[model samples]
Target: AWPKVQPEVNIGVVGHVDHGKTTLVQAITGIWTSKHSEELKRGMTIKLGYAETNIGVCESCKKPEAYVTEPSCKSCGSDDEPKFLRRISFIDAMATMLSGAALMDGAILVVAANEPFPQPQTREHFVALGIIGVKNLIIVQNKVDVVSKEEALSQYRQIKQFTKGTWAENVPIIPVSALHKINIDSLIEGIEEYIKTPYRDLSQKPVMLVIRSFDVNKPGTQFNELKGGVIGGSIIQGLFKVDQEIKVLPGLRVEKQGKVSYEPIFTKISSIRFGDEEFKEAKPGGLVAIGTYLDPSLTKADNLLGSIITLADAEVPVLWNIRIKYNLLERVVGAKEMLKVDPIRAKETLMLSVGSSTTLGIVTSVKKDEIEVELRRPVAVWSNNIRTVISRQIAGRWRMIGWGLVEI
Candidate 1:
């Protein structure tokens, strides 16, 4: 039977180097993404982290038979393997460019409440989203447990100003603390509401972006049968069914290892658990997988997969020109500062953002009344995209001044 609503939503986490984007996801999913040996040693979330859940399981075997596996079910019988349906990939700010083609339904930009506005990476991520044209975004003021309400509000104002003239101008901001699990429900609700539209299609082209890959070796299984890989990702457009023929992009192809070379292969999905119940199928918003038999190199996180389409060498634009649009009262600068710039170059110095994602950028140009910046990268910037925020610089040991968006 076809599932009632196969909603799929792809959301990326963006922030500066150590602002807790990974920790928040870990807290929400209860799956430690920093489980890699290197990540465990460093005690930080790095470039790529993945978590998922499955919808269907074998009625008799009681195991997921999908594309990915859960950390807990290392011993489940092959016939009991569950099928995958929902997934989440916490990508580092540096790798947000991959999120564009991943076709995420929305994005969550994490910001530490104590940090000043326009941190280098923060501006860069925003500009990147602008260039890539990802419109659904939410601001998560993370680490709120460490700061006072006044301090949090101040930072919120600064964030608002920074997003004023971009696509995130009117987007919702949810304050949270990953350590304490504060206001996470609100954050999830916001994501659910923001991505409600794009998740309507559950049976379009089969598209899944690989976010994780792993191999498991059972204690007694034969050597040839012991080697198996799990691929994790969200289904962007179509439904992933059992025994569906799939091809991994960039040269990991497996078409029913036929006759003598044919290896008995199947998929198992074990993430996305709800209380004691599991699902049989996953839609667009959640994680899902396609288990395969061949021992191919599926290590990269950006590998795309589908049935009808084979997108192995897809490329997207990396640069854009964003117009500055600000709405705030202006102030005049002292003559001493006014004489420091050429009139024409100063005229182009309107405050703007540029980058390949929605969470980082650099302020490259500034003027008395306006500023023009060459973004460190590019995003999808178009008319009506209003990225606004308050600008601030520490004045002294205990004081700070705020400048609202004065120009576009």
Candidate 2:
């Protein structure tokens, strides 16, 4: 009954581009996250690489040996009934995690000990995590194998200095070499201590934010042999039953008579799966993929990404124009230099990342505490805490300026 198929929570493995996030995921899960060709070519995770692993506890083992990823105890070689601890799904990459932060119950901020403290992307990742309201955080000082002991200690002090006045000022900094699998047991133990599984509500209507959608067809497959489209993401609340009719809002874009609008998509769930185990009812926990009867063309190439999935009669609204309560950060995050953040002006374009959706919001009106913006692409809103991360184009790069909450 234990060791369920679904992961209990999603953890973000975030850091700078070359800080060994993907490598760490591989070391823990025995699965390399960067499988895409573009990621292979770049030698970095350019997209969200999802992987799942199980953690177990040994009763006889102590401290570091108490927590392990293997089913059996590795310390004493005990094969006799290890206690199942937790199953975790890892979300890899930085910017992608920012968009999908609602799914992040906890996060591991990886920093390379060989480099300076607070790399640009490392700063960016931490700020994004803060903006997205992720409270459970663990700092990992990676690549310690490449640095001298004194250098590593100095780097640790620098890390303390960098986080001195920040949200992670008192956070634990676990030093390990992800490349060489050193102190991995201690890291897992840290995860057990820090990143506790969040309590989820399963009685409400099912709501899932779509992060990835795709077709599961082979080339030259016959028409009858072709399968329906598949949508993958984590459920935020409630439960989904098989054969249920679901609605996707801010769905497909419709253009007619020189006017563009969005229509909600309705489809039946053909199947539901978490990893290889199929389920008749899926709950709010791990990431899941729902096979739908919609045409494969609509879901292929991530066309339906950022769509909200719920019951066909759930009545989630599709909002094109929204008024958000805004709060600007003291300074521009992620930038190397200390640049002051300017206020949002009327008629200016800003990027809004809400849930897994990223859209352009043009300011229509501005007030002291709130602003009205018309989204270029519509999004569905159904929750009270609709936290939105705001970014602006600065020096040809998108820099985070502030955040807001969607107000009805």
Candidate 3:
């Protein structure tokens, strides 16, 4: 039997690159977020890596005597290690913050004990979270097994000072070894507690954010499937149920041939899944997924999913006041430089392709660095923010340098 109680929630993990954000999620959900072959080669989660995991034992564990096995270091034969099994998604923190997906219920900031405090990416990640008004945070001081307790505490104090007066000012910091599975239970409890909010009445309106989509090949014709995402949000005003027909904003149109006129398409809900379980309906706080009448290919990721019930229009910031910060990886091309902007579209403009989705935007106020950009399409919403990576025209090939977010 299924649990009668269902609470709607959406949570995300964030931190500097290589800060163990993915590893922490794997620990909690026992799912490997980074399944990319490249990531496997690099032994790191990068780009739009994502996976779904069941809340069970660590899948990385391995034992000849046990039925299941855990992840082990190929270089060193060690089995008494902690493992992360949750479905984790890897998005550059700065870019994700810009992408609006960073606005989640709660996030965990991964800090490595062996590393210095306030690394460039670390500072930028905290600042990005602040810009988006994200309040809940869990600071996980990871890789504790590599550093002494005193060293770890010293780093923590430094981090506290760095985050003071910000949303993470009083955030709880947990120390753990993902390889050793220490302090994970406490981390989970902290997450549930921090993300709790009072229940509200359901609304007739429906809003969903597209995270990913793919095409499926059937026996006869090729069918498409768009994986609608971010199905959980505050129901400001109606009741929602499964199999309901809904209108997608900025409706999708398809042209079979170059000469044919565009045809509008509407999608129907095939099924609804929430918290990794089947549900007939959903309200505020419960994350829900609706199978569409059309294949996923018709819909694209980073697009909005909702009914024609007065969904708020996207907004671009006027002036987009903020500074662009860079990380160590970006230092080679003169980091710490401010971004240049075009005054006219400053409010309506956005920096694209900094993180996981193309719809992400980052606010820009003034020009400082050598990199510059002009936005072609502007989304008029606070959540459409994204980070952009640029390179000097000198190289002919534009390379990713750094990312930024929008500020009103």
Candidate 4:
């Protein structure tokens, strides 16, 4: 009998814009995230590139290898088998991983040895990781092929200085050339040795967060061949089974007398896919895409993002505004340079990133340490509650100045 498949650990590959975050992921999994059409145009955007690969050490050579499919030891060829290691699922999300940290099990922060020790996003990314609960870290000092040995040493010392007084201070600082594929085996080994998979509970109520959604059927497919809408994301908790009734909250948009209304979209799970493998039932916490009967048009272009997938009758309120206990930062993040952050003022519009949703909110009022901001679009309520990553317009680019915690 075929044995039960193992669960996956969701790892985030994050760093500064040009600092080898995408290349490192590509080197291990052969998936270049920045090459996506939309992502390539501006060279920035949380493309949500997902890749799965197994970390194994070749039996003959005794060297670690990253196998995309089944492990095929390069040096030893077909004769030798690779010592099976854990399967890792890596997602490339920028700073959004901070506010929406639940999507990740642990994280691998990439930094370029050629660049300064602390890139702006480097600081931002780590802070975000800390604010959220992702404690496990394995630092990657990339692009070592070009940097001089002395320069690399200086950079390493600078890294130590920057990571001082942080969770990353004690984690492994792995050096590798992601561009040339040098020392990647050590990097793979580090990922396996340091980052750990989180335990999941099946007894808890099933609740999944929607990071992505889409229509799988291609245009002009025959009516009978057309597949239902598909929603892809991580199952944060509990279990979901095929044919089980499901509901998406703050789900479908409605209009009444020119007034906006909302209701849950009900559907039955037809199937589930985990790391290119299909299973009748989703096992606790992992990534899965659900096949549903909802119209394909509604799921296209991340149309259904920010919706919550839960068992039927999982009620969540739809709100036009939220009261946030704003904690504005002293300086703006992701900006070209650090600058003093202004206070949250009335009549100002700011971008609020919560879960998988990003919406523009206008400030209505400000109290001692709280501000009520009205949203342009409603987001599915996160029952666990979360702080919103607040970004402001800075020189034609949205810079993450700080964050706000919801009082409710």
Candidate 5:
């Protein structure tokens, strides 16, 4: 009876820092994505946060008001059984959003109604989603209750102006108060209507990006009672089953005579789970945790954060030196002041995020639109068309400048 409704899609909540992305997610899901102590202390999401909710619909009410996350619809108060539509998992994203980008099916861009048109992180997140090729979006004009209607309307105009000429120009801009839980049902309806579950190719080799991993054993646990390491991530394609042998690429780092190398880690799947429910097999969908028969030390404290897990026989290329054809932006994204992006220089160090992994790449060669770099830490290339987000250190912070495709 477990997983009566399995989360089938990942909907990313993205926007500027302190723009209520997490708040909006909690409003709809009734679960907070940020549970880390540091996140609570700093009031920011240092790591990706995830939450899920089961969506239902009332037959009597119209459109958005009918779509609800609760057990019963609030509109009609009818005792009639409602229709359970789908399960949605919300990814409370990073400002870079690069870590969560690979898991995004559709995204909710949270723009605070009290703030100006496009905050720095707002532009950064929007541009980041654009770079990731996330085609579906719903703009949430949140914090409307805190601001005057006049001010909120002014910000709405700003949202319209900021998205002009972009793919989001015609997207729905729903006004809501995330703090007060207003218009959340309408927001759910927007997700149901605007963002759709993409057709997944089940024939491809199973691949999962390791966004989070941890050792589940608590302090002073007996060795006989110890549990295997758990790796949490989303399956991009194909399927994974319990008891299957899997390979983790760009895995454990090995050091020899001042040189560093990585060998693939092979382990058997002890279990596969999503939230509290266990699944015998899992396919492309929301976040899942894989219990692996590996040394707890190997996966503890996010030791295997950026690795890719897949079927043992699956072919994947591990790249240390990669050539990429990039589209450089005219101006820097996520900066308050307009800063023009400069040309790539030889031997210049840059940060590149591919999937959930970020590695420092030193530019070895530059040819107009293409550049070859040596990554300090290698990455596993699972897809032929894997997107790489390129960023430069501006004002002591990594700011997204462009995106690229690995030249396979």
Candidate 6:
């Protein structure tokens, strides 16, 4: 009875690329999110990485450790008696890329002390959280080993000043070395204390936001041995079970008569996988890979990325053109130096990220605070409203300019 079911909560690890988000995830879960060989070679996250672990208390020193079921307290060698806290589903999204920002319950903002405070992605990510309503944040002043005490202090002061009026104004900034594993326990404690798990609504209709899709069959495998398409993503709300029919939106792109048309794909859930465990039904907490009755080629190479998964009868919103009322920041975000932001002009292209999806949008018209834009590729939403972060190409790099809501 000491350790029962581990409740799941999602915590986000976000920062500028190479800010050691993967290293931080490894420190927390003992698993690396970027295991893709190409990613390892290029030193970047190609997709959002997810891993699960339990953070419980060891009765010996009354400290939190990775696992509660232990032979002995590794820290203080006492009785194995433990108290379980909760299971954390850590979400790792590319600060350089866009995916899975809306799903974060609370986020850990990482900034290396050696770098200048509030880098490009740093400002983008900070505003991204607020735009998505991620009201709680825990700042990690990482890479303390490479900087002197004075340098770290100066960086910390800059961080304090940057988040002054934001939602993270009162958030704690804990300095730690993610590479050297210094002050990690304090960071752990900070997570436990600051990021509280929110209640999941089981009564709502189940919806899964598709992040990755692929085929499981190998070319060399026998025709009889081939498997169906598998779609992987997190269950944002409600419960999904095997045998349930799911509707994937913005599904197959059909180019007919020189115009792109989308036909919703319907598939029955054949299997559900949660981590290495099999579940008949998956609730909102962690990532799940659902086996579907679709051709293997349809799901290969993430062809169906950004699609919405819901019951066949449910009607999820689909938008091709959107009205956005946005506020431009005083300065352009993601520059080596802050530059004054110019107002949005008509006929400009911008990058839009909404829930696990990133697409380009063209400005059709401009108003005082509202603008009309057309997405190059349409997006699907189940809820009435969706949060969007807009970015502009600056010096060949897409820099976050501002964020706002799509009018419902």
Residue-wise C-alpha lDDT for candidate 3, range 215-313, written one tens digit per residue? 222336422433332222222224456666654433453457675322224555655554345667655443334455554445433233222212333
Candidate 2 per-residue lDDT over residues 354-374, each given as its tens digit: 887888989999997898999
In candidate 2, which residue pairs get closer than 3 Å at backbone N, Cα or C atoms, i.e. clash?
none
lDDT of 4 by residue, 1-408 (tens): 113353567787787755377678888876665545442111112356666666566655654543323456655564556667666777776334533465778888888888887877778777777655578898888888889989888988888887777657888888888878888878777777788767767787677777667766666889998878888666777788898888887788888886886778899898888755779787544567788888888777677777768888666556679887767767655445667887888989988877666778898988868888898877666564566777788788776666667666
Model 1 residue runs over 4 Å out of place are 1-7, 17-19, 36-47, 52-103, 211-233, 248-282, 295-408
lDDT of each: 0.46, 0.80, 0.45, 0.72, 0.81, 0.75
Q: How many residue pairs clash in each candidate?
A: 85, 0, 44, 0, 0, 1
- TM-score leader: 2
Q: Candidate 5, which ten residues in sequence have the lowest lDDT sum?
A: 37-46
RMSD of each: 14.3, 3.3, 10.4, 4.7, 3.4, 4.0
| lDDT winner between candidates 1 and 4 | 4
Instruction: Give TM-scores for every candidate, taking all chains together and pairing residue i with residue i.
Output: 0.51, 0.92, 0.59, 0.82, 0.91, 0.85
How much is 37 displaced in model 6, in angstroms? Answer: 10
lDDT by residue for model 1 over 116-230, one digit each (tens)? 7656567656654544446788888888888999999988887788678755789888899987877765665565556344635554545454444444333475875554454
lDDT-wise, the better of 1 and 5 is 5
Candidate whose lDDT is highest: 5
Give per-residue lDDT, candidate 3, residue 344.
21
Candidate 6 ranges with C-alpha deviation above 4 Å: 1-7, 16-19, 31-46, 63-77, 93-96, 114-132, 145-155, 256-259, 334-336
lDDT of 6 by residue, 285-348 (tens): 7677788999988998787777778998888777788877787778764445667788888899
Q: Report model 1's TM-score to 2 decimal places.
A: 0.51
Off by over 4 Å in 4: 1-7, 17-19, 30-46, 56-85, 93-102, 127-133, 283-286, 334-337
**Number of the candidate with higher lDDT, 2 or 5:** 5
Give the higher-lDDT candidate: 4 or 5.
5
